[PDB]
């Protein structure tokens, strides 16, 4: 039923929309930009003689193009047929790739969002979602991207993460305040991320092998994902998805470029709240996997070596977890899950560890605070 639909759509190219019939077409990205300008312009958006009272033509154009892209991406053949080398499946994927350029898919994701704003009085000024650019529009773009073009090359993954994926995560983390949490846009963005972006980065986790001189981007991604995981408006499924995504990324990531997230981890785990379950498991997996990086002086050259500052930080983590755990009241699951972490940290820490008498000065009060995290 997918190939036949592809036959029919290519036979009648006027089904693709004025932007994409093929003659005098501005492109998908240009159409989406024209649509977001029309949505702002009141003369074209409304009749000018809610949704039924005023059918926003900008939103209508955007949702039409998103539906077309979603339908084409779903019509894309399964990965296994391509692996088996089915000629018709290869042909369908080539046709879809010719129909939709990669740059047009990248641009729509690169388009930003309308930032929800509180006001002088304190009430949040809600930008109407049904009249503007929506996360579902980008979600369809992502489905087409990972079902037709495929994210299988590392510099492409990093470029996409830098241009379109990361700013959305930062906006979601910025709407983590209680007032902004209840905003509809925050909910829609959270759903979009947890359904499309996080699973994509989880399935493309092995591509995160070598990111040495994109250290800043991978650190920023980890920090934004951890803040979003701390977010409260998230649902149980969203929490599970973000936990799996962060664990998968951190597992493949090289142990050298994760001390910055370790700082947040070693402060937030000792609270031993409900939120600490994911971070303490992440520490467990990290210290069980990269144990030779700490006990052995060298390890492989690719891991590197300890800087003694992460060693002091890990010892502080061990002692803080142990003390918080000791004065903490018994909870079955919490202790049964904390014990492997304490054991792993103790094993990773060298037995004869030189404790530097010179303790670190000038602690990062921004990463280290009571309220606001800033």
């Amino acid at each position: 039923n997918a190939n036949v639909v592809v036959r029919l759509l290519i036979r009648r190219p006027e089904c693709f929309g004025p932007a994409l019939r093929g003659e005098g077409g501005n492109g998908l990205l240009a159409a989406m930009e024209e649509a977001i300008k029309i949505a702002e312009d009141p003369s074209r958006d409304g009749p000018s003689p809610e949704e039924d009272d005023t059918i926003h033509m900008g939103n209508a154009i955007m949702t039409f193009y998103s539906a077309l892209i979603d339908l084409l991406g779903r019509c894309a053949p399964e990965m296994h047929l391509i692996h088996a080398g089915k000629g018709e499946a290869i042909r369908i994927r080539s046709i879809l790739r010719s129909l939709i350029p990669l740059g047009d898919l990248v641009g729509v994701i690169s388009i930003a969002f309308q930032m929800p704003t509180i006001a002088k009085d304190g009430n949040v000024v809600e930008p109407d979602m049904s009249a503007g650019f929506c996360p579902d529009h980008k979600a369809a773009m992502v489905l087409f991207l990972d079902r037709v073009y495929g994210i299988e090359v590392q510099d492409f993954l990093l470029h996409l993460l830098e241009v379109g994926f990361l700013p959305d995560l930062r906006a979601a983390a910025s709407l983590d305040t209680a007032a902004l949490s209840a905003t509809d846009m925050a909910l829609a963005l959270n759903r979009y991320l947890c359904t499309a972006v996080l699973p994509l980065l989880t399935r493309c986790a092995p591509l995160f092998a070598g990111t040495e001189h994109h250290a800043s981007l991978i650190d920023s991604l980890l920090h934004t994902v951890y803040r979003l995981s701390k977010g409260c408006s998230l649902t149980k499924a969203q929490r599970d998805s973000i936990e799996v995504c962060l664990l998968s990324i951190c597992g493949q990531l090289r142990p050298s470029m994760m001390q910055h997230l370790l700082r947040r981890l070693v402060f937030d785990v000792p609270l031993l709240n409900e939120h600490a379950k994911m971070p303490l498991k992440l520490l467990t997996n990290h210290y069980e996997r990269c144990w030779k990086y700490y006990c052995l002086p060298g390890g492989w050259g690719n891991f590197g070596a300890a800087s003694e500052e992460e060693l002091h930080l890990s010892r502080k983590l061990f002692w803080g977890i142990f003390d918080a755990l000791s004065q903490k009241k018994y909870e079955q699951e919490l202790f049964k899950l904390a014990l492997p972490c304490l054991s792993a940290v103790a094993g990773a820490l060298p037995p004869d560890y030189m404790e530097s008498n010179y303790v670190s000065m000038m602690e990062k009060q921004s990463s280290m605070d009571s309220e606001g995290n800033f």
């Binding site: 036959r7 290519i10 036979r11 190219p13 693709f16 994409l20 019939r21 093929g22 003659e23 005098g24 077409g25 492109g27 000629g87 042909r91 080539s94 046709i95 010719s98 129909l99 350029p101």
Partner: protein, 394 residues
């Protein structure tokens, strides 16, 4: 009995275009060396500008069903609608294909159509489909039927682009009706007989003179004269002429006595013609009119004209034979015979005369495919490198 297109036949694909409310017939063309891309060659204004069908002829090598094509890809038949056909460019020997690249003539949903070396893959194969309800899948394809060609690789119709300023052919989702015109059938061609489109040398009655042009002294104006010469020029490339009939369909048929044709110099691209002052001078493609460039072969110099004849839709009968026939060149309109000036590397000038001489017979020798290929390569390369030199000089 309507003829059916079958494999190993030579055809040209024609598409009609309405430009400024003027019906114009165009043929799909390609030049093997230099430009893999395909262009369009006009055949409507044949009376004034002779078309170049040597780069438009295609050979139908294979005609397989879709299922059989898929099976062999995984691993003189008559064409029926729905089969997959492999078209070989007669001149280059390369195959029509969807190039999978786009020249981006404001149509992003399109691919370029060109020529390819290898036969492997699904890009070279095309499927033929009925133009109207009168034809149906599995039915034999007549010589006069209109066709729609669909690329196996992309399901893109062989499309004619009106929108762009200069007409192009590409693979697009809009369909274009193509008409297949039979050029020749090699199976029904008698060996050793003159057929249209042959590259040949015009040998004189002593068999050691050939109708040639002056050698290259970098002067194209001096290369415009015609004379008889002997020696190694008989194995040189400047003694090669291509006989081009005035018809588009069945142009590769046998040549009969009295049939008009144009004589084109292969290495210069200029057609033989008679000037108003009764002098032979090569002139350009744009000016090469039927009135001036029409010639015929007479079995005898005797004055009884061949009269009005009908062109037949077939290979015809074999009349002129290579090396065993004596021919006399006659300008169609003037009736003058081709003869030597007899004034004294002979450099005996070839002139037109009312009566000529008794030893004015011309023998025919057919050149080799290698020689014709090399001569057209030389012409194309010298044209391109002269354009390059002019650009560098500017």
């Amino acid at each position: 009995e309507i003829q059916f297109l079958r494999t190993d036949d030579e055809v040209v694909l024609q598409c009609t275009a309405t430009i400024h409310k003027e019906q114009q017939k165009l043929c799909l063309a390609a030049e093997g060396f230099g430009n893999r891309l395909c262009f369009l060659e006009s055949t409507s204004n044949s009376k004034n500008v002779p078309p170049d069908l040597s780069i438009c002829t295609f050979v139908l090598e294979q005609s397989l069903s879709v299922r059989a094509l898929q099976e062999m890809l995984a691993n003189h038949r008559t064409l029926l609608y729905g089969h997959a056909i492999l078209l070989r460019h007669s001149y280059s020997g390369m195959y029509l294909c969807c190039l999978s690249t786009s020249r981006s003539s404001t149509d992003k949903l399109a691919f370029d159509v060109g020529l390819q070396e290898d036969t492997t893959g699904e890009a070279c194969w095309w499927t033929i489909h009925p133009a109207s309800k009168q034809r149906s899948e599995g039915e034999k394809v007549r010589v006069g039927d209109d066709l729609i060609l669909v690329s196996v690789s992309s399901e893109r119709y062989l499309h004619l682009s009106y929108g762009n300023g200069s007409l192009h052919v590409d693979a697009a989702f809009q369909q274009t009706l193509w008409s297949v015109a039979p050029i020749s059938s090699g199976s029904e061609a008698a060996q050793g007989y003159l057929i249209g489109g042959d590259v040949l040398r015009l040998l004189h009655g002593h068999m050691d003179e050939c109708l040639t042009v002056p050698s290259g002294e970098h002067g194209e104006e001096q290369r415009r004269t015609v004379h008889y010469e002997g020696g190694a020029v008989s194995v040189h490339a400047r003694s090669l002429w291509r006989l081009e009939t005035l018809r588009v369909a069945w142009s590769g048929s046998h040549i009969r006595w009295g049939q008009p044709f144009r004589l084109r110099h292969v290495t210069t691209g200029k057609y033989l013609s008679l000037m108003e002052d009764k002098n032979l001078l090569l002139m350009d493609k744009e000016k090469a009119d039927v009135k001036s460039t029409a010639f015929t072969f007479r079995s005898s110099k005797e004055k009884l004209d061949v009269g009005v004849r009908k062109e037949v839709d077939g290979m015809g009968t074999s009349e002129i034979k290579y090396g065993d026939s004596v021919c006399y060149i006659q300008h169609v309109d003037t009736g003058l015979w081709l003869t030597y000036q007899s004034v004294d590397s002979i450099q005996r000038k070839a002139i037109m005369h009312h009566e000529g001489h008794m030893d004015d017979g011309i023998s025919l020798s057919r050149s080799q495919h290698e020689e014709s290929r090399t001569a057209r390569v030389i012409r194309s390369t010298v044209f391109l490198f002269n354009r390059f030199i002019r650009g560098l000089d500017a």
